[PDB]
Design a protein around this ligand. Structure first.
Ligand SMILES: *O=P([O])([O])O[C]C([C])([C])[C]([O])C(=O)[N][C][C]C(=O)[N][C][C]SC(=O)[C][C][C][C][C]C(=O)O[C]
Ligand SMILES: *OP(=O)(O)OCC(C)(C)[C@H](O)C(=O)NCCC(=O)NCCSC(=O)CCCCCC(=O)OC
Ligand SMILES: Nc1ncnc2c1ncn2[C@@H]1O[C@H](COP(=O)(O)O)[C@@H](O)[C@H]1O
Ligand SMILES: Nc1ncnc2c1ncn2[C@@H]1O[C@H](COP(=O)(O)O)[C@@H](O)[C@H]1O
Lengths: 529, 75, 529, 75
């Protein structure tokens, strides 16, 4: 690559080595396991670069990671892209068959896998062709990653290349035949960091991330860069605490003992934290959770506001950076009582800097922002995936009409608040994972005696939504719900179906509502059953 | 085969822990390391072996063996 | 495309409309269903081109076909490539999950599916995204293909384009994680036709295909262009008989009633034909079967030679056109008795025109053709797939060292006869389908109590090879063969495993042979169990 | 439940044809349309229901109900 130093490229190395602030004695904490300053973190990143170079990782290679939220994942967020390689983040919560498919599709060269994820590998390790090396990670001195790092020097000259080289990739299981691969460049990640820092750092007094915070993620960190927050924290040079496996009690202990002030999670985790008996004698009045999983319910928001938690909601998705919207309260709205506060904080929010976010109908006609008309959201931003990896038709359907199609139906108020009414599909979302209703319909239709199977979604608190199934039996056929539940469970036991179908809650009916054309009225069915 | 023995053996079979080593105060998540999801198929078999129906509100209340034992013996 | 008429492009339309011979009143026969001359066949091809154009099929589209050997498949072999579209041939004998994977990978626009293959579709139809239209085929006047054709004119001006545009694609399930996609161009298919016609038409008196033959395939016709034979037959303008579904009795009836003289099959079908009671009072002394499935056994060859059948063997594979080698007997060898004849006719044969076929060791060192030294076969020819579709690492391993790696270990005599000794892997091949030993090993290792599972292959006549499994039980564990057989069968019942594992024949052992390093001695195990 | 009735019901369950409509002369491939592979899991259940072991040489000999009936009643 011809440098031309006057021509500046936006790279992740500039994010690490040209931060907003850098205190060499600020800490990085891995829960009750490890602690080390920022200087040793930089040294470790350089050592990891040396180790990867020794392993034979070139500028076009892919390194896949499968582990929990820890300092090692933070080191991988930086070392692998800075060498010019591609970081493939594996969703450990997918079924083994889907995990194997994503590994084969991405063509990973090296795999860094945690010890306790080894069983999942053991039932797919035979069918993996591209992988040359496995590095097994442990939480003790026995870790292979740690032994690899300590054989290397803390010196390394990181290359400079084009800012449009791909940095990260991960696979979204949004309803389709197979998982789809998204990817982002160095430029896009740097611009996402800068834009969101501009948006949420400049807020007057509420819901701001600044250089005095202490950050602890509660998002799995293989889900779209942990909403980009680990990159931002490193940019601000703040104390970072990584909990590892999510356990409510140890999480609360970390919050108390480390004085965490900024976190992000999904509604289920927040509900679990609030329902824990250990969370009654704690001081929560310094904490700034961002809820972005799905549809922060107003009841949970009110329950959190009485604990003195600055809870606000945000909107994004796998294809969008992810962050697209955040709720910011004006100083007049900061003095409303708890009910109106809960109503405002549970909206999807206003769009962030450099985002367009129109609302459109099926003919690509921009609807008015009158506050009640609904349509699909279409966006333009500096950090959107241009297409799906190794895909053409779905890529064209993603960017139809010159805009990125989110797949969510919402209405936009006069001041700019966005409220998502539904999806453009009849799909379910159990907790933070995607599950397809059509696939469950087919699996249940493969039963011995089934007339019509239609799967709809019903709301929930510990899960957000449950995949209700409605089955009509054949002539003189009588099978209990246990039979069909076990039949569906058998598929999950083979690694075909994700574990989120373990609470399917099937229901036997005899009449199926159908439209004038005859299509199953899933909205009417939801209002019925 | 009393209620407590049956409950403990369900817990051991589900979570893989030996029934002889199960304790009355063991917590599904913290002690036995059961994932929130695993604890749900757990409640499923409790009902299956006691031919009952556990309402959701109570299903969230059980987090230790003791809980389940009390709920079952009480019905 | 700029034509430049002096610049000649090798296209399949030139194969259809510039044949070696064209008799407008020669017949095309679909067994007991339909008969029509070559003139109506040309008219039907033009009508099918019109119908495909009306459906919106452009020059880059893919049309997938799923049916039996019939006149419709022959029409698809010509119409779809001539329009410039790509013909994806679906292997109906793969598991539904693999079929769905191949459909999604190839991104088919239209699917032409037979009626009796509908159930397979019904359990994957939900997870198909790219397909816009299904055409259901039947053997009566109710067929949708027939109704589509009769609404169109018999006039069409076929385009001329570059000869390097892709014509056909199909997926090989040779041992890997997922099926691999091969593809060929118009030029490659035309050159394969011309080269094999030159090789087998110029033979003096034995095993030749000429303009007076009557041709009937017994290869499924979705397996690598039916060895290219339907293209050759059309070039020679000979009578063609298509049997449909392979049933030994109806096949024998067609052979007798239509006076078939040239066919190709795999050893299993030939064994079934010879073992049929209807095949004792028939005159087989005009028939020229080519056996190319795998390792034509000498016993079957002798049994066929006593019926006065000109049986000879050929060698090819999915990546190679397929044809690479054919056995041709010199007039001195035509007077040997039945035993030496059977020995010679069962070899893999000499290479065909324009084929190189060296024998090499693991360091790419060309071994001598002394007749006993063995090595892997590496080939160069005008009709080899340049790589696997949408694949990089396996593509590089396929063409390592500038030659195509077959994966078969053989030795070459002084005169040029090739004899394949084994494979470069421990893989099984039940009848004409590929089955992976490693995947079965993993599936069985997922059992409740298993110590070591190793799968080897043992020969057979009705199947060619059976996938023997050797399982060592754990401490104080005793499970019968029925348990493990049913456990494996359950996976097949879910569409995960191919049906060729229904004769696994597991075996319980207690000692596993291991090398000095410790690897399972699969050859020693085969000699043991 | 004689040998013939059991054999015919195995054939009907395997190939999906009603046992009341099964004929003694029905051929697995030609008449009932059973694929060569299906006929092998067929032989498998015959053995399973008669607690015997069919050698391969004989397994290829059975192609109609009659065959299987004779082979079984004869052992
Ligand atoms: O501890 P339990 O009992 O096992 O709890 C079960 C549960 C819910 C799985 C548990 O909380 C847990 O461990 N993980 C929860 C699942 C989760 O964390 N899902 C998060 C990923 S969802 C996602 O990627 C959405 C991406 C778009 C969001 C962008 C955004 O919000 O921008 C603001
Ligand atoms: O069901 P049945 O009638 O009792 O018999 C079972 C089988 C499946 C064996 C039956 O014969 C059948 O219907 N089909 C047999 C399977 C088959 O036909 N396989 C053929 C494809 S194998 C292949 O593609 C090899 C390609 C390379 C060969 C190239 C070559 O030979 O060049 C000369
Ligand atoms: N704040 C939110 N409000 C409502 N739905 C949300 C919110 N954040 C995410 N979602 C939904 O969760 C989905 C994320 O899925 P994905 O990123 O593709 O893996 C989005 O497409 C939304 O439908
Ligand atoms: N005449 C033959 N002799 C021996 N093996 C053969 C012969 N024809 C095919 N085969 C084998 O069958 C395989 C075909 O598999 P494929 O074409 O990849 O789908 C080849 O790779 C060979 O191993």
């Amino acid at each position: 690559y011809v440098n031309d130093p006057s021509n500046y490229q936006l790279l992740i190395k500039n994010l690490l080595f040209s931060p907003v602030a850098f205190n060499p004695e600020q800490e990085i904490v891995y829960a009750n396991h490890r602690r080390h300053s920022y200087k040793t973190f930089h040294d470790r990143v350089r050592q990891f670069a040396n180790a990867l170079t020794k392993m034979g990782v070139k500028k076009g290679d892919t390194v896949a990671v499968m582990d929990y939220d820890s300092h090692r994942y933070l080191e991988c967020y930086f070392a692998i892209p800075m060498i010019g390689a591609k970081l493939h983040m594996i969703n450990v919560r997918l079924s083994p068959e889907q995990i194997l498919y994503t590994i084969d599709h991405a063509e990973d060269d090296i795999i860094l896998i945690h010890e306790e994820f080894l069983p999942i590998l053991d039932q797919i390790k035979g069918r993996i062709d591209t992988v040359t090396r496995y590095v097994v990670l442990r939480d003790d001195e026995e870790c292979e990653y740690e032994r690899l790092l300590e054989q290397e020097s803390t010196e390394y000259n990181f290359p400079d290349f084009d800012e449009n080289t791909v940095a990260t990739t991960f696979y979204t299981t949004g309803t389709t035949g197979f998982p789809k691969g998204v990817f982002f460049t160095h430029r896009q990640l740097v611009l996402h960091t800068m834009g969101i820092l501009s948006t949420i750092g400049t807020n007057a007094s509420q819901g701001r991330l600044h250089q005095g915070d202490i950050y602890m993620p509660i998002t799995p960190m293989f889900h779209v860069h942990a909403w980009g927050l680990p990159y931002m924290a490193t940019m601000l040079g703040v104390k970072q605490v990584y909990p590892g496996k999510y356990v409510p009690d140890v999480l609360l202990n970390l919050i108390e003992q480390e004085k965490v002030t900024f976190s992000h999670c999904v509604p289920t985790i927040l509900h679990l934290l609030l329902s824990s008996p250990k969370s009654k004698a704690m001081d929560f009045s310094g904490w700034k959770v961002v809820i972005g999983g799905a549809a922060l319910p107003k009841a949970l928001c009110k329950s959190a506001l009485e604990r003195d938690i600055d809870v606000f909601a945000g909107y994004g998705m796998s294809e969008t950076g992810p962050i697209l919207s955040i709720v910011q309260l004006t100083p007049e709205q900061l003095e409303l009582d708890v009910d109106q506060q809960a109503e405002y904080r549970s909206k999807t929010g206003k769009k962030v800097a450099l985002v367009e976010a129109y609302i459109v109908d099926e003919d690509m006609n921009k609807l008015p922002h009158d506050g009640e008309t609904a349509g699909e959201i279409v966006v333009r931003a500096p950090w959107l995936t241009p297409n799906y990896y190794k895909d053409n038709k779905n890529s064209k359907a993603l960017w139809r009409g010159g805009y990125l199609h989110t797949g969510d139906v919402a209405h936009i108020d006069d001041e700019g608040f966005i409220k998502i009414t539904d999806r453009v599909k009849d799909m379910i979302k159990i907790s933070g994972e995607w599950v397809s209703s059509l696939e469950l319909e087919d699996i249940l239709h493969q039963h011995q005696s089934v007339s019509e199977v239609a799967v709809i979604g019903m709301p929930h608190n510990k899960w957000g939504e449950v995949p209700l199934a409605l089955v009509t039996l054949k002539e003189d056929a009588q099978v209990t719900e246990k039979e069909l539940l076990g039949f569906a469970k058998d598929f999950i036991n083979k690694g075909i179906l994700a574990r989120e179908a373990l609470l399917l809650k099937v229901k036997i009916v005899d009449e199926i509502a159908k439209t004038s054309v005859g299509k199953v009225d899933k909205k009417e069915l939801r209002k019925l059953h | 085969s009393t209620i407590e023995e049956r409950v403990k053996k369900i817990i051991g079979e589900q979570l893989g822990v030996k029934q002889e080593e199960v304790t009355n105060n063991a917590s599904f998540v913290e002690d036995l390391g059961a994932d929130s999801l695993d604890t749900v198929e757990l409640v499923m078999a409790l009902e299956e072996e006691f031919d009952t129906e556990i309402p959701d509100e109570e299903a969230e209340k059980i987090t230790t063996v003791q809980a389940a034992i009390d709920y079952i013996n009480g019905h």
